[PDB]
Amino acid sequence: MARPRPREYKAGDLVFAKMKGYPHWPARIDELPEGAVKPPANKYPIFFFGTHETAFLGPKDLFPYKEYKDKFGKSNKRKGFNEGLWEIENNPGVKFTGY
């Protein structure tokens, strides 16, 4: 028995986000403003802490921050990663416009 990860997220949720070639990365779900070009289905606008980069990712690549902190939140030499660990804890609202 294994609790599934969420299939839906909301603006402001804190996560680890996984992209190819990168370790699981501290990140946030941004909001999708109405009155904009619509994103692909079931993909979410992601804000990466540390580098402040963005991308769109589906829930298959997203991991709720508190539940996965002990597994993915270990220090890493990749540029911006350790800064990112700091922001997700101390300034998770940096550049956040959702609310």
Partner: peptide, 5 residues
């Protein structure tokens, strides 16, 4: 500040 990948 931009799109990753």
């Amino acid at each position: 500040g931009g799109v990753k990948k």
